[PDB]
Symmetry: D2
C-alpha cells in the first residue's frame, strides 16, 4: 500500500492521540523542503539570465516563514541567524526547532549535494520564550532528520518509532515512503573525514585511520569517501554503513560542526537507526549546550566502527 509523508505522520499522530501540532509543523517543514529543492535544482534560472529581456538566504526564509506560519513553534534557531528567533505571540506554538537551512551550500558552485538539517524539541518550561529554550541536550529530541538534495531529493525522518526515508516525486510534489524502519549495518567498510587535515589530527585519529588503511590482520582496508557536505556523507554512512568523523584536534578542541542543528539531529537519526554518535568523551546526545551556536566534535556511524574508534581513542587518554 502506497504511503506519503503527510499520510504517514497523520496516521502516526492519530495512533498517539496527539493534538496535531507536530503534524502541522512537519507538514509545513515538508513544504519548505519542496520549495528549497526546486530552487536548488535551479527552477526559473532562465529568468535570471535574461530570457525575458541568495540560495541559503532563500532557504532560511522558506523554513523560517513556513515554521512561523505553522502555528506550532515558539523558538527557532538557524545557522543563518546570530540569535534565536522568537515567534510573535499570535503564532506561538509549543515546539522549539533548530535547523541548518542549507548545509554544504558553501561549496554549491560545484553542484555538490547539499541538504537541510532540522531538530524538534518540545518547549519544556512555561516561561516567556527565550534563547534558553533551545539549550536542551539532543536526548530531548522529539523528532529530527534531514533532506538530501542529491541525485534525487530524499527526506529522512527520525522519531521514537524509528527512521523512515521518503523520496520526493517532483512530478506530483509528494514524498513517497521508500524505506521503512531503517537500521545501519553493524559494521561498515568506508571511512569519511578530510584527510588533508592530517598535520593537525589528534594522535588517536591518526592511529584509527591508519588501521583502516593498513589493517593489522588480513582484512581488506576500508574505502575512503568524503564529499565535504555533511548531509551527503552522513546519508551514505547511514545507507552503506561505516564511520564519519569530524573530530577535535588541538586547533579545534570542540570540533567544527554546530551541536544544535548539525550534530544532534544526525546523532539522533544514527541512534534511532541503531548506530552510535560520540564526541570521543561522551555521546553527542548527552552534551548539554550552553550556547546555541557552540561546536562539538562528532564521530558517528556503524556501532562496531565507532566502538573501535573509542578503543583507539581511550588508548591515547
Amino acid at each position: 500500500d502506497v504511503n506519503t509523508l503527510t499520510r504517514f505522520v497523520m496516521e502516526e499522530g492519530r495512533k498517539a492521540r496527539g493534538t496535531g501540532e507536530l503534524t502541522q509543523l512537519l507538514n509545513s517543514l515538508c513544504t519548505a523542503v519542496k520549495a528549497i529543492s526546486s530552487a536548488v535544482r535551479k527552477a526559473g534560472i532562465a529568468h535570471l539570465y535574461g530570457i525575458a529581456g541568495k540560495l541559503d538566504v532563500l532557504s532560511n526564509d522558506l523554513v523560517m516563514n513556513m515554521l512561523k506560519s505553522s502555528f506550532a513553534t515558539c523558538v527557532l534557531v538557524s545557522e543563518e541567524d546570530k540569535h534565536a528567533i522568537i515567534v510573535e505571540p499570535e503564532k506561538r506554538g509549543k515546539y522549539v526547532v533548530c535547523f541548518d537551512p542549507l548545509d554544504g551550500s558553501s561549496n554549491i558552485d560545484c553542484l555538490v549535494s547539499v541538504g537541510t538539517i532540522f531538530g524538534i524539541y518540545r518547549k519544556k518550561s512555561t516561561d516567556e520564550p527565550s534563547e534558553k529554550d533551545a539549550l536542551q541536550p539532543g536526548r530531548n529530541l522529539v523528532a529530527a532528520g534531514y533532506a538530501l538534495y542529491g541525485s534525487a531529493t530524499m527526506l529522512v525522518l527520525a522519531m521514537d518509532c524509528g527512521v523512515n526515508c521518503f523520496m520526493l516525486d517532483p512530478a506530483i510534489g509528494e514524498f513517497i515512503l521508500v524505506d521503512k524502519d531503517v537500521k545501519i549495518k553493524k559494521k561498515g567498510k568506508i571511512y569519511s573525514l578530510n584527510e588533508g587535515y592530517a598535520k593537525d589530527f589528534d594522535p588517536a585519529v591518526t592511529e584509527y585511520i591508519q588501521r583502516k588503511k593498513f589493517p593489522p590482520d588480513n582484512s581488506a582496508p576500508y574505502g575512503a569517501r568524503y564529499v565535504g557536505s555533511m548531509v551527503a556523507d552522513v546519508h551514505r554512512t547511514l545507507v552503506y554503513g561505516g564511520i564519519f568523523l569530524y573530530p577535535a584536534n588541538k586547533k579545534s578542541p570542540n570540533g567544527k560542526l554546530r551541536l544544535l542543528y548539525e550534530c544532534n539531529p544526525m546523532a539522533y537519526v544514527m541512534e534511532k537507526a541503531g548506530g552510535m554518535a560520540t564526541t570521543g568523551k561522551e555521546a553527542v546526545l548527552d552534551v548539554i549546550p550552553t550556547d546555541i551556536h557552540q561546536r562539538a566534535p562528532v564521530i558517528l556511524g556503524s556501532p562496531d566502527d565507532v566502538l573501535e574508534f573509542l578503543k583507539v581513542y581511550e588508548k591515547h587518554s
Copy 2:
C-alpha cells in the same frame, strides 16, 4: 543576451559552414540528458510504488535510441554493452560516440551525484563500420563533455572553441548558457583520490600526497575531497581547481577508469580548459586504445598541480 545549448550549437555550426550532422547529434544527446535527469530525480516514482494500485539500463536505452535516430552516428560504445553497436545502414551517419550513460550509478542507492559522459569522434577509416572505429586516441575527439546530475543538472560541452557550461532549467526543459569559455585555475588547493588504496600506492603517488598533507614550504596543506563519482570529482576539480587521481592498484593494475568513454572525454575537457591529464607515462589523449573497455590510470586537473605530480614521478624514474 541569453543563450541556450541548441542556439549556441546552431550558431557555431553556421559559423563553421558545416552540414548540421554534429548539431543533430548534439541536439539528440541533449534530449537524452533531460530524460535521464528526469529519471534520476525520480519523477514518477510514486507510480512504481502503487499510487494507482533499472536506472542505468534506461539511461543507456535513452542515449542509444536518441543517437541511432539522429542519422548522425554509425558506431556506439557504451559502458553498458560488451560490444560496439553498429547502427543500421539507413540510420548511419559519420560520427562515433563513446559514452557512459550513467557513471557512478553503482552507488546511487545513497543519492550520490551521478552523470553522463560522452566523447564524439569522426569516423576515420573508410572500411565498413566496426568496433575498430572507436579505437582512436583522445587527441582525435571532435566534441566531449558531461552532464552532471547533482544539486542541479549541468551540461559541460567542450569543442575546439573551448569549454562551455549549460544549466538545465527544469521549469522549461532548456539548457541555459551560464559559463562561457571556462578556464581552470593554475593552482588549486584540493586533492582528490581514494586514499583507502594507500597500501597499494606507487611510491610517486605516496610522496606526492605527503607533500599535500605536509608541505615542504610550510604553506597550508591541501584539502581532500573524494565523492567516489568521477563526474562529480572532476567537475569540482574544474570549478575550484586542484587535482584528481585514480592511479593503478593491485585490483586494477591498468587503473580502473575506462579510457574510451571516461578518461578521454574528461582529459579533453581538462585540456580545452587549460588543464592537464596524464597517465603517469603519457598524456591520456595520446594513448592509442586497443580494446574499447580498456582501463587507464589518470591524474588530471590544474596545470601546476599536475606538473608537480610529474616532477615527483620522474624523481622515481
Copy 3:
C-alpha cells in the same frame, strides 16, 4: 500569511475538534488530483512515443486507490463504475465519496479543459456499508468540490466555512490558497448552454434565452460561452457570474448530467458561494436520488439570473 490546502484543512479540522478522518480523506484526494494533473499535462508522453526505444481509466484508478488506502471511506461511486465500490473492511472509514475522476474527457482530444468532481457524505447506518449509503440528497453534503485542469490547475473546495480556491503550483506540488470565502456575483452577464439542442428546448428555456439575446429593457445582451466541459463552464460562472444551463428537453426529461457526482457537488459549491441551483421544479440539493447514475437537469449560477430563469419557468406552469 501564506497557506496551503493541507495546512488549511488541518487548521479547520483542529478547530472543529474532529477525529481526522476527513482530513486524511481530503489529503489523499489532493494527492490523486496532483497525479491526474501530471498525466493530463502529458508528463512522460515522450516515452509512449519511443524516446527509449486510458486517461480517464488511469484517473479513476488514482482516485480509487488513494481513497481506498485513506482509511476514511467505505463506499465509492464513480462515473466510471456501474456499481458502487465497497471498501475492504480493514480499510473502512465512515465517509461516502461520489466522484467523476475526469469529466469532459470525451473531448480531451482537442485539449479542452477537464476536471475531477467530488462530493463527500457521511455514512448512514452502522450495518453493512452498501450502495444505499450514496443515495442521499445533496443537502447532506459534508464537503464537495472540483479540480479544474485548465490553463492552470485549480482546486475549489466547499464546506460549511465557505468556498476556497487553491492554485496548484506545479513547481513544488502544492496547492496555494488564492481565494478565501469566495462569493458569486449577484448578477452576471454570460449564459452558458449548448444551443444546438434548441429544437428540443422547453418553452421556458427558449423564452429565457431570447431574453438574454434581445433584452426587454433594452439593456446589453448577454455574452454566450459554452466550453462543453461542465467543470470549466461552472468555474467560469463562479468566477465571473452568469448562468449555466443543461435543461430538460423534449428528448431527455431528466437531463444529461449525473446527479450524484456532477450536479450535487456543483450545486453545493454554488450554494456555499451564494449562488443557486435548480432542476426547474426543485433545488438540486433537495432531490433524493434512487439510482447512483440517475440524471438531473440543472440551472445554476448568479442568484438574480437563476431567479430570472425560475420566474420564466413559473410563467409556463
Copy 4:
C-alpha cells in the same frame, strides 16, 4: 521512431538545403512557448503569495517572444498585438524574417483558467529597402510558416508549412515538443458551429439564417452541436481536430470584424488551408486580403470546406 520539433525542423531544413535562419527562428520561438506555458500553468506562484515571506502574463509573454526573436539573429521586423508599432531589430541582430504574433491570445478570460494560446506568422522580407513597418504589409499568401500554441489541458504546438500541418505535444517532464500528429487534414464536413450567439441581435442576416439552419435543419436532419470557448486558439484548434465551422463574422456595427488580420486571422487561415480547410471573410479569402494597417481587423469564417461553402451560399443568398 520518435521525433521532436527541433529534430523535425532541422531535418526538413537540411532536405531543403536552407541556410538555417528559419530553424534558428523556430527554435527560439519554441523556447519562448515553453517559457509561456510554464508561467501560464503558474509555476512559482507560491512565491507571489509569500512562501518565503513579477509582471502580468501578457506582458511577460510579449517580452519572452520579443526577446527570443531579437536574440535569434533571424528577424528584422516584429509585429505584436501588444505594440502599436512594428519593432525594427537593431542592425547587429538583424535577420531576414518578419514575424507577426499574438503572444497570449484569449488572455482576457485567463482569470477563469480557460484555454489560452500564442499565435504567430512568419513572412520573408520581400523588398530591399531598409526594414520598416511596411515589410509586414503582406497578404497571408506570402506566409513562409505559421501556427499556434494552445495552453489547454496539455500544451500543443501546431506548426504549418508547405509540407503541411504537424502537431507537437509538450512533454513537461523533459521540456520537449513530441510529434504526435503527422500531416493533419480536416474533415470534409463537421457537426459543430462556433460563434458568440449572445450578439444575435446584431447578426448580419446571412449569419442569422445560416445559424438558424444549423439548429433547425431544413432536411429534418440532426442539428449541429454548439461550442464557444471564447478563446480563438481553443475554438480554432477544436475545429481542426473535430471539424466544423468557426465564425467571428462581420455585422453592421463591425463591418471589418474584430480579430486582427496579420497575427490572428492569417496564421489561422494558413493552418486551415494547409490542413485542407477553408477560410473566408465572406467576400474573399483571408490569405488574399492585402493589409493596409498592421493592426487592421478582418472578418473570418473558417473550418471544414463543406460547411464554409454552405455558409457562403447562404451569404450570397443575402447578396
